[PDB]
Amino acid sequence: ILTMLVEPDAGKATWVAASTYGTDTTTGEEVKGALKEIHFSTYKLAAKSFI
Amino acid sequence: ILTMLVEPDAGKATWVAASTYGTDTTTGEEVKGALKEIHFSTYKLAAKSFITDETEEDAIFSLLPLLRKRLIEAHAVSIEEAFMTGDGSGKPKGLLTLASEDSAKVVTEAKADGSVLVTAKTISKLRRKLGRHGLKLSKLVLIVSMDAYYDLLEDEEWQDVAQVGNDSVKLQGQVGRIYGLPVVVSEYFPAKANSAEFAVIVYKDNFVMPRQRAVTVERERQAGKQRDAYYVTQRVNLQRYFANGVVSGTYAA
Amino acid sequence: SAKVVTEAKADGSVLVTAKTISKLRRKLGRHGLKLSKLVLIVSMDAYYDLLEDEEWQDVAQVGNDSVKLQGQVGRIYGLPVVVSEYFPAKANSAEFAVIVYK
Amino acid sequence: EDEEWQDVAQVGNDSVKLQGQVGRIYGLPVVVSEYFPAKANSAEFAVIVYK
Amino acid sequence: EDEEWQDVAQVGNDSVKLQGQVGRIYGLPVVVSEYFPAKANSAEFAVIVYK
Amino acid sequence: SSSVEVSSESYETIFSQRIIRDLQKELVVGALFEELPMSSK
Amino acid sequence: IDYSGLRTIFGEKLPESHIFFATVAAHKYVPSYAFLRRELGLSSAHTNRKVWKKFVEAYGKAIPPA
């Protein structure tokens, strides 16, 4: 198998913040995400002969 | 704030008649103008990520680049979206939202549910609203929604080589120029619906991005909670020198 | 869910006209628009119907690349055309084309 | 306003939209005079003499 | 007045509107004579001999 | 301005003196023609 | 445009392009590719067989229902 992560979708950034500068809220809400693993695998194909 | 002054609008001069000539009125009516002002300002943008020290140990891979990528992408995503469609209340008013205010969302024949398609003409016809802010043609940009771009390729109008040139769709496939405007596709228009928006024809020179701070990263190890917080903050807006300048199209209602 | 069903019919009637082939790009989605990152594999009997397409047929409708003048539709609507025969047999449903994001 | 002579595929670099004066019609030079009888029913609009 | 020969995108620089004398039809030279039998039913308007 | 050490207004603006005006309708019918330098009424 | 009137001149099937335009009778109902093309909303940019083929289809599509 091959499990490769996929970076999740776009978070978006807290646009406002506004008057509150210096308070905790100026840094905005968390932009967060979860990586999504996706598996890969290989099937086997063969042929045979007899000389 | 940055305030620039806008020159006052033109004032006509009286056509003085013969009666006057030596009457103090022979010189007409005073042309008085007041230098108006334009004010610019900024709106913040922000993000927090926390990586607990325990996790980096817990998991196999690092996870650190992702936090950074996410935050910077988020500022871009938000800015790109905001600039397109912003409430204006706290976020930058946007090309789509500015047009609506200026009564420039031109409802067009293009139809939601297929049926009419967004043909090139429907997109070029938007230029009329721009007004004089329109004729030059090398100072304009066209941003069409992805669905429009796709509809623009299937426009029967641009495919025929004796209909457009060696640039016809049949022959080429990528409608690159519509009626003298470059075509650039973005997908951050509102999604297809009755009304909604498929295209804007901003008059670029009118818009400036007032800055004040640019994307910076500050890591604040918060021991006692064992996290290291990356707080990336940024402050910018999109404002227009003058009220006119963008005209947007809408699918028909 | 990308088996767009085109109107082209089996047993003559319509032929798979060229336009039908590039209509399909829309269902690709965002991935579709770029156009230099796609490949078109058409069934052999949809290359013989891309020729009889009324559209690619005229030095005017197209360019110096028109069929009467040349004979091999090499480009359809901005996509390269590559012919393979392994597609299933023409019949109802069936497939005449696919356009992968390589 | 002859729909016939107006395009550049209905004629050449001599088309009206592009140029504005139909100078040649079907191989004849075109010369305009205002001395033709006044426009009316019947009347005459062209004479193709033999010089 | 064959609608067929009268365009520059239909024929070439040899189109009627532009020129006025159909001199070549489909690869044959055109020579006009007026001793063909009088126009009438049946009658003849053209001959194409193997000289 | 939300911090200790504030400064009065007008101190947070740069007041550019760039005077910008708009597109301003173009004038075409005045200059095209020629003049008859009249020297009498 | 006047497919109906043309039916009197040419019944079901339309003759080939050369003859249709040639016929004096049809000239009035449709004169030259200028008229046919403008009526179809086609352009000089569309090649004439495309304009004719479209005209022929209209002639059939429109044919009296029977």
Numbering used by the authors:
A (entry chain L): 205 to 255
B (entry chain K): 205 to 457
C (entry chain L): 307 to 408
D (entry chain I), E (entry chain H): 358 to 408
F (entry chain J): 164 to 204
G (entry chain b): 2 to 67
Per the authors:
Bacteriophage T5, a representative member of the T5-like family of siphophages, serves as an excellent model for studying the assembly, infection, cell wall perforation, and DNA ejection mechanisms of this phage family. In this study, we used cryo-electron microscopy (cryo-EM) to determine the structures of mature T5 (a laboratory-adapted, fiberless T5 mutant) and urea-treated empty T5 (lacking the tip complex) at near-atomic resolutions. The T5 head comprises 775 copies of MCP gp8, arranged into 11 pentons and 120 hexons, forming an icosahedral shell with a triangle number (T) of 13. The T5 tail, which comprises 40 trimeric rings of the TTP and a distal tip complex, is connected to a unique five-fold vertex of the head by the connector complex.
Using the local reconstruction method, we further improved the three-fold region of the head to a resolution of 3.4 Å. In comparison with the previous study of the T5 head, we built a more accurate atomic model of the pb8 monomer from residues 164–457 (out of 458 residues) based on our high-resolution density map. During the maturation of the capsid, the first 160 residues of the N-terminus of pb8 undergo proteolytic cleavage, and this process also occurs in the MCPs of E217 and HK97. The asymmetric unit of the icosahedral head comprises 13 MCP gp8 monomers (a fifth penton, a hexon I, and a hexon II) and 2 pb10 monomers. The center of each hexon is adorned with a decorating protein pb10, which comprises an α-helical domain and an immunoglobulin (Ig)-like domain. We resolved only the α-helical domain, from residues 2 to 68 (out of 164 residues), which contains five α-helices: α1 (residues 4–10), α2 (residues 17–24), α3 (residues 25–30), α4 (residues 33–41), and α5 (residues 49–62). A structural comparison of our α-helical domain with the nuclear magnetic resonance (NMR) structure of pb10 in solution reveals that the α1 and α2 of the pb10 monomer undergo substantial conformational changes from the solution state to the assembled state. In contrast, our high-resolution structure indicated that the binding sites of pb10 were consistent in all hexons, likely due to minor conformational changes in the centers of the two types of hexons.
